[PDB]
Design a binder for these strands. Structure first.
Ligand SMILES: Nc1ncnc2c1ncn2[C@H]1C[C@H](O)[C@@H](COP(=O)(O)OP(=O)(O)OP(=O)(O)O)O1
Ligand SMILES: [Mg+2]
Length: 425
DNA sequence: CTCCAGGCAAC
RNA sequence: UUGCCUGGAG
RNA sequence: UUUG
């Protein structure tokens, strides 16, 4: 059955190569992704047998404290590389059982479905007159997930008793803190490969309830938001869904993240909207600030690397960043931050020329007139003040950086948009 | 379509 | 987890 | 370090 289908040779190697590819830090054992291929070849006849025999206890997941963009400490769960390999092999065969019957409005942790699908449907709601959204988020969602309510949802379709025991065992596997197992009464491990599927299984009933109620919503993981026409209707259904998920699913709601405010002052998947009747997608202020704070140090504060290297690092990140923020319909702000990127990249190039004599000889080399070369070189104004002067725009400008190998942000923004909406449409 | 090296994003 | 992007082998 |  399904467990035999999980322990199949080809389902194990594809699951293995994934855990290998991720290059995740090692579990409680300390055995890495690099040692995983050699490791399982040695112990498979055992591991296979003892979990075919229902005598396989998985290792406890390892506690790591990582800071979250909000400022909170995210408690991550890191399983043993074998446990990651197994959980992957469960996930791979559990996806086709559960995924097809998941909501059409469910966009988080599902294959063939991205944040862009969630935002395009969301703009539809404010597009068609539902100009109030009830944005929602759960407190420590993965940490609070209820074992009995989860396995009840899991057991509905999954008839093989062997996998239900196995999945419960992974949920029940305690964690390690300074050399002691701490029993997990609540949660699915953050970073467990299977855990994101289990998360959608629980909130599939939340989608079915909202679908029964006949509401116009978009869910990505716990971050779930319903579109209504009025604030009163939104505030009414804010309490009624809070009552639902608190009683039926047994979860507590994050009131700081949850709100009934207007769509374009709230952030949804790194995007926000415009107050317009045809609400255009814009970058959320956080999303802009995260870019700026990343580009500030790709630009040299006191950083000693090759300038061509810096241009490659600045470009590979920006080009990757815009790959995901190509959805926004405001090119103006993209043109501004691109200029700000160049202006930021001028500061590092200016400071590199430590000597007043080195400034003069390079600027003359760049082609700038000798009149302007001696004026700005002897400036008594600050570094950031000199970067925004007429001279350094002329010598080091859009022409210069583009020739020095810098990839244009706005150029690629259009290149991506043009081809892609030619396809879907 | 499969998989490798690397990157970006949402969680 | 998932989506995407550059490069590579089939 | 820092997982999924
Ligand atoms: N980097 C990550 N690795 C693994 N799981 C993650 C990661 N980021 C987010 N998740 C998962 C687990 C989280 O419980 C879930 C929802 O994200 P989020 O709401 O930001 O965190 P949270 O619900 O655990 O804390 P909070 O109470 O602040 O919402 O998404
Ligand atoms: Mg949450």
């Amino acid at each position: 059955a399904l467990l035999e289908r999980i322990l199949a040779r080809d389902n194990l190697i594809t699951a293995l190569k994934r855990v290998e590819a991720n290059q995740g830090a090692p579990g409680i054992d300390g055995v890495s992704t690099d040692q995983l291929r050699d490791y399982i070849r040695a112990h498979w006849s055992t591991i296979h047998a003892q979990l075919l025999a229902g005598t396989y206890r998985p290792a406890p997941v390892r506690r790591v404290e990582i800071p979250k963009p909000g400022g909170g400490t995210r408690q991550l769960g890191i399983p043993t590389v074998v446990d990651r390999l197994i959980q992957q092999a469960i996930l791979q065969e559990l996806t086709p059982i559960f995924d097809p019957d998941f909501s059409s409005s469910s966009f988080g942790f599902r294959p063939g479905r991205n944040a862009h699908d969630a935002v395009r449907q969301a703009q539809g709601y404010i597009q068609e007159g539902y100009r109030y959204v009830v944005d929602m988020d759960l407190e420590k969602f993965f940490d609070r997930v209820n074992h009995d309510i989860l396995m009840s949802r899991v057991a509905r379709k999954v008839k093989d008793k062997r996998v239900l025991k196995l999945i419960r065992a992974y949920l029940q596997a305690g964690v390690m803190i300074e050399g002691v197992k701490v029993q997990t009464e609540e949660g699915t491990p953050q970073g467990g490969p299977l855990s994101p599927l289990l998360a959608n299984i629980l909130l599939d009933d939340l989608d079915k309830e909202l679908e029964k109620r006949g509401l116009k919503f978009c869910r990505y993981a716990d971050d779930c938001n319903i579109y209504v026409k009025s604030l009163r209707a939104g505030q009414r259904v804010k309490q009624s869904i809070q009552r639902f998920l608190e009683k039926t699913l047994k979860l507590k709601v994050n009131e700081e993240k949850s709100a009934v405010d207007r769509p374009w002052k709230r952030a949804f998947l790194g995007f926000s909207f415009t107050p317009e009747r045809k609400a255009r997608i814009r970058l959320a202020p956080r999303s802009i600030q995260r870019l700026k704070q990343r580009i500030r140090q790709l630009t040299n504060p006191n950083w000693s690397i090759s300038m061509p290297e810096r241009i490659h690092r600045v470009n590979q990140y920006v080009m990757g960043w815009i790959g995901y923020f190509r959805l926004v319909e405001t090119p103006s702000v993209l043109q501004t931050i691109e200029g700000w990127i160049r202006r930021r990249l001028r500061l590092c190039q200016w400071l590199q020329w430590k000597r007043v004599r080195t400034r003069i000889r390079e600027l003359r080399a760049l082609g700038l007139k000798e009149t302007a070369v001696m004026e700005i070189a002897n400036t008594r104004k600050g570094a950031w003040r000199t970067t925004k002067t007429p001279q350094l725009h002329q010598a080091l400008g859009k022409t210069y950086w583009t020739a020095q190998g810098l990839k244009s942000l706005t150029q690629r923004y259009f290149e991506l948009r043009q081809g892609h909406h030619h396809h879907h449409h």
